[PDB]
Amino acid sequence: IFFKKDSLWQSEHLEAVVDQDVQRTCILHGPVAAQFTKVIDEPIKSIMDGIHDGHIKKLLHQYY
Amino acid sequence: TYKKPTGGIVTVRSEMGEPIHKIATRGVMLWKEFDETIFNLPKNKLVPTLEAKRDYIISRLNAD
């Protein structure tokens, strides 16, 4: 319990970790979805529009 | 991800014994290690094991 409880916030507040050391912290992340997390500090709108505008472009080509 | 770090991500049990995909940091590697060795032991064996490993546990906790 002492080891495992409340183990998620640390990765968002490295100020409140010993040495501010990320390597101490749990970061939740998917093995397969980790192929496409590369570009840091991309705006959410740029990502989400990127996926949607991709779908539109391919659909247009195939059915219109 | 259930055996070793795979694309920099690993699976670790939570406190309820349910899997979690985490980036395999030093912290998460210690977590995975204590799942394999300490937290899987029966209740009668836990306290003896902790007393025995105490100074190792403590160095890892402070370092990682």
UniProtKB/Swiss-Prot annotation, chain B:
Domain of life per record: Eukaryota
Extra remark: Present with 91800 molecules/cell in log phase SD medium.
Description of how the protein assembles with itself and partners: [Alpha(6)beta(6)] hexamers of two multifunctional subunits (alpha and beta).
Free-text function comment from the UniProt entry: Fatty acid synthetase catalyzes the formation of long-chain fatty acids from acetyl-CoA, malonyl-CoA and NADPH. The beta subunit contains domains for: [acyl-carrier-protein] acetyltransferase and malonyltransferase, S-acyl fatty acid synthase thioesterase, enoyl-[acyl-carrier-protein] reductase, and 3-hydroxypalmitoyl-[acyl-carrier-protein] dehydratase.
Family label: Belongs to the fungal fatty acid synthetase subunit beta family.
Listed name of the protein: Fatty acid synthase subunit beta
Organism in which the protein naturally occurs: Saccharomyces cerevisiae (strain ATCC 204508 / S288c) (Baker's yeast)
Gene of this entry: FAS1
Parent-protein start and end of this portion: 835 to 898 of 2051
